[PDB]
Amino acid sequence: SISEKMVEALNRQINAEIYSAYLYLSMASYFDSIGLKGFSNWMRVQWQEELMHAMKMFDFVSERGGRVKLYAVEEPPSEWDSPLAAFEHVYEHEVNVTKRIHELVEMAMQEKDFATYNFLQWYVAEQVEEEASALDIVEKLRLIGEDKRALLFLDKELSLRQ
C-alpha cells in the first residue's frame, strides 16, 4: 500500500530531520564558543529533539512495510554573526521544514494514503510549536539588543530547558 514514491520522500524528510539536528549541534558549538552555555543547552536539546523526530518517521516507514534508506548528512555551517542571527536562522529553517511537511501532507492525500496523512498530522502540529518557540526567542533577542545583562538573563532562562 504505501507507495515507493511516498517512501523515498519520507526518507528525504528523515534526512532533513537529521540535518536539522546536526545544524543545531553546530550552533551548540558556536554558542559554546562565545560563552553562552544556556543557549548551547537549548541547542543540544533541540538536536536530540530533531533526532527523535527523525526516528519516529524512521519507525513509521518500517512499520508501513517501507524501506528506510539513509543518505549523506551535509556539513552544516558553523558561524553566525550573533545569537540573534543564530535564532533568526533557526526560525527560517523551521519555516522551511514546515513547508516540506505541508507538501508531504499534500502528496499523501493525492495518493489517498490516509495512514501517512494522519501520521504527518503530528508533524503539522509540532511545526506550529517549532516556529513559535523560535519566533518567541527571536523577539526576545531583538529587545535585548546590545544589553549584556539581558543577554545573560535569557541565557540562564534557556539553560533550564530539558
| Residues in contact with a copy of itself by the rule CB under 8 A | 1, 22, 25-26, 29, 32-37, 51, 58, 62-65, 67-76, 78, 95, 98, 102, 105-106, 109, 112-115, 117-119, 121, 124-125, 127-129, 131-132, 135-136, 139-140, 143-145, 147-150, 152-157
79 contact, one of Fe ion, a copy of itself, none, CB 5-8 Å limit per kind: none
Q: How far is CA 75 from CA 13, 19, 26, 72, 119, in A?
A: 17, 9, 9, 9, 29
Q: Which parts are annotated binding residues for Zn(2+)?
A: 17, 50, 53, 94, 130
CA distance 83 to 138: 9
Q: How far is CA 66 from CA 3, 18, 96, 133, in A?
A: 8, 19, 25, 33
CB of 74 closer than 8 Å to CB of 104: no
Q: Which parts are annotated binding residues?
A: 17, 49-50, 53, 94, 126, 129-130
130 contact, one of a copy of itself, Fe ion, none, CB 5-8 Å limit per kind: Fe ion
Interface residues for Fe ion in 87-146 (CB under 5 A)?
Answer: 94, 129-130
85 contact, one of Fe ion, a copy of itself, none, CB 5-8 Å limit per kind: none
DSSP for 97-161? HHHHHHHHHHHHHHTT-HHHHHHHHHHHHHHHHHHHHHHHHHHHHHHHTT-HHHHHHHHHHHHT-
134 contact, one of a copy of itself, Fe ion, none, CB 5-8 Å limit per kind: none
Cβ of residue 147: shortest distance to Fe ion, in angstroms? 28
Please give the grid coordinates belonging to residue 5: 514514491
Cβ of residue 87: shortest distance to a copy of itself, in angstroms? 13
Q: By the criterion CB under 5 A, which residues form the site for Fe ion?
A: 17, 50, 53, 94, 129-130
